Point group: D2
């Protein structure tokens, strides 16, 4: 079947809405999971290890590399799930707000992948299918939206970085697959904040009209649940996805395709 | 839970072909009940619970598939439209009837088959919260054009767009049927073999080795796919794990379309 | 800058909403225009010739080729603008309805381009920039929609045929550019009928709710006017577009990109 | 007709290969052109004004706004053409190289558009078709490539920022169109440097094999000339493009579509 036997997996933002479900799903497929987030401690069901980890910190990433190096000697799967959103009027958004979003959503992938690259190369030797790097983009990386300039721009950067790394790692013979994941509206605190800030900005009349409008834009007719992200990430991390690199893996209830 | 097809009644067309045989094996391995169909009057398809002779261009052929599924199971949970053909031709020497022949196998198959199995797919939609799953075999050729592949590419773009429309329509009508398109890159099957040889005979390529190396180098991963590398993706789309996936382009192309 | 001096242009569906504006725009850029449509006669402003022409008829296309051959000896620009739409429930749509839409929207381009290919090759020798074939696809060729299965499928076929012919004509050295045009909601009888059938199908509560919904899906916030298609087609037909082939040329008020 | 009569246009990187052709083409369509680049002085054919302008400098942009405000009272067209490229091995690329490319290619558009927004709103009142913002992305913003991680990521950011601003400015009623332009391989010093650095990196055996490979990846079979970018930018800046916003305008010889 589709499984993660003998897969050492790093999952960032692992205490968040999607992150907790990714850890559960990956443990259920038999992965060894190093879960990381900003809290000094967390109870992440399915994590074999929890590390305090700011994805903007090279030192934080070196601590992840040290634990993986010491305990396992490789990383087979790297899930860059940590990210933030802001909802703002472009003309009232200082350059520093774009930079803050870029640092969390994009620099995290650049720093993390550079620091774990020796360990990912070892995973490329451990499985014929390759090591697997899974970057959380968004439907916002595919389709623009009013008031989401900073967020959408960062998620398009994540998408394109995924294509470039997939092509480069294959050309250099590292046997490391890199793919971008594009969730639609998923029922988490992040989507909650975006909807509330849309109301305060006066993009939506009320939080109920906003919710109904966003749900109706999805052909499937509802928000996604965080658990509905799990199987896709397990697939991309598995040897079943050995021919999948540089790809836009969409889990959006049809949002981007209508 | 995990990614599995427990109590999934699956119809797979072109099931005796290079990819089709691996789809049946993969889906059986995930515990699906598989009705395999192809043009031969009989075939030994590893993992098939039933084999039916089935021309996907024939409404009567599809009604025989519906009758067996109706009688034995009362539903269809997964429908994999994998039957397809390719031609390689000079546009100016391609009669309208060659476009129509490719359209009939690659597109009309999905229209006729989905219409005939729709009552059974609606029952699939009631049997699983995630929905019935219709998986349409498009191509990277449905995403990116190519010289001398006008008839094939046009049909595979039609398959892709039909998938989006049916996903949106079945959701709007409340049927709980997911529809997605699959886009393989160059997969090592008799079909890829014939396309390369016919490219040589047409005088597109010097030799079969230069053709193969050129096609391999277009894939960032640096090689053609193996048929077995299609199996997991189709199992995922057919499973409840893909409950939030409809209208989607599911690409298995070694990076071909993205550089 | 952007002109069609010494350009012999064939425009199909030339009596329709967009077609009439294409002929006006192309005449205004100094093209010689052969206008064609289903009516036995028409007064098409800017046309140097009108021909009765069923785009599904090889004999109809041969009559267009004969007039162009006899009077000018070439075709520099071929605009495949003829098309139909239907709005239907998939499960109630006979295969013959898909085939009827395919015959007008796709077979027209196959038959017409094959019949005019000798004349387009002469266009290819007359201008460094090349002969130009402009195929009318749709945003419906880029994004799906409930109840538009037959229409959307045909317009995606038009889009992909455009890419294949652009690549093939370049590989064979014919100097013929081929591009697809993707209009959004344009205010013509065709959009009117689609909206009116959407109501009778019970897809929309009223035509006013349908119209407002469709207008709001366009970021620009309104339907296009037929005249807003003219400049884009003039550009693609001109030497200014000498580096444009196989391209999706979108005129959709941002519809496809959100 | 496609013209820029009474259009006040700002063009950045105006002394470059493409920039000089954009200024010539826009003057030929009767635009008033404020040309800007890094040099303290330059002889830019077709420019009514030249300003020294670092597109990373808020103060530099305020000087452009002051001249336009004083002399014309509006900006009708803003062409963000300034940009840089690097070719690097991801694992040897410091975070500061990504940031440098982002600052020139993306922050330029954020700072410039914020500073000129009052003047663009006046452009929006001067023409029913709207003010026009044209952002130079790349085929690199659509398709990834090995060794172009920093460049491709920045050009995908430019593409998505274009979609977001098009949607946002329309939602706020400012009547400002925003589009991204995606050139293929254009014969300029920038393409020259990329090809040479590809050889030094050992991505290509020789500069002749690199050149032939890049030319053959374009269906049209050659590099573009800078002049082949001019018509497209004139079209997007004109009232002929009144229904074009949020759009990917591709001038790539078919590169992205095969
Ligand atoms: N929920 C949606 O609708 C949606 C849609 C598109 C994509 N996404 C993406 O999915 C991913 C998961 O989002 P979510 O919905 O679970 O949101 P969430 O906010 O619940 O989870 C994000 C997690 O990232 C962590 N994080 C933030 N900054 C960090 C930093 N500097 N260092 C370390 N950890 C940091 C947060 O602590 C949080 O636990 C994100 O990449 C998000 O952008 C979400
Ligand atoms: N191999 C590749 O490189 C490649 C690339 C992209 C897409 N695909 C698609 O994958 C699918 C499977 O292809 P494959 O490579 O295994 O090809 P294949 O030729 O090995 O198998 C296709 C099967 O369809 C059957 N078939 C043909 N016409 C039929 C009809 N009228 N009724 C019933 N069955 C019919 C054939 O007999 C065959 O068993 C096709 O849709 C193909 O277009 C393959
Ligand atoms: N209006 C829109 O919203 C919209 C949307 C996207 C695409 N388009 C496309 O733009 C093009 C122009 O359409 P329009 O909106 O002006 O519609 P229209 O119906 O006003 O014009 C289309 C013309 O095609 C002609 N035609 C139909 N069948 C023909 C045949 N067999 N032979 C010859 N001529 C035939 C009709 O006589 C008519 O004059 C079409 O291809 C259409 O699908 C329009
Ligand atoms: N030439 C190609 O093949 C190609 C490919 C795709 C995209 N592009 C894009 O086209 C645009 C123009 O490219 P080109 O080939 O003319 O490049 P070029 O190097 O010839 O011109 C770019 C100009 O930008 C200017 N510039 C650089 N940094 C600046 C700064 N901080 N402030 C102000 N001006 C600055 C340079 O001085 C130069 O004159 C760029 O945005 C480039 O990314 C070009």
């Amino acid at each position: 079947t589709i499984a993660l036997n003998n897969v050492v997996a790093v999952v960032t933002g692992a205490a968040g809405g999607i992150g907790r479900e990714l850890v559960k799903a990956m443990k259920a497929a038999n992965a060894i999971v190093i879960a990381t987030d900003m809290a000094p401690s967390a109870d992440v069901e399915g994590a074999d290890h929890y590390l305090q980890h700011d994805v903007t910190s090279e030192a934080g990433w070196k601590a992840v590399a040290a634990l993986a190096q010491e305990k396992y000697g490789r990383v087979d799967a790297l899930v860059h799930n940590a990210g933030i959103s802001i909802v703002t009027k472009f003309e009232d958004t200082p350059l520093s707000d774009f930079h803050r979003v870029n640092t969390v959503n994009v620099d995290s992938i650049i720093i993390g992948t550079q620091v774990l690259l020796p360990l990912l190369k070892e995973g490329g030797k451990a499985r014929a299918g390759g090591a697997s790097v899974v970057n959380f983009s968004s439907v916002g990386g595919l389709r623009g939206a009013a008031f989401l300039a900073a967020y959408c721009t960062s998620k398009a950067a994540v998408k394109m970085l995924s294509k470039c790394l997939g092509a480069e790692f294959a050309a250099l013979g590292y046997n490391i697959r890199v793919n971008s994941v594009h969730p639609g509206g998923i029922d988490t605190p992040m989507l909650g904040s975006i909807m509330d800030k849309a109301v305060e900005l006066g993009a939506a009349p009320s939080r109920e009209v906003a919710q109904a409008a966003m749900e109706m834009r999805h052909p499937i007719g509802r928000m996604g649940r965080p658990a509905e992200m799990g199987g896709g990430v397990v697939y991309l991390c598995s040897d079943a996805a050995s021919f999948v690199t540089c790809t836009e893996f969409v889990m959006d209830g049809g949002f981007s395709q209508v």
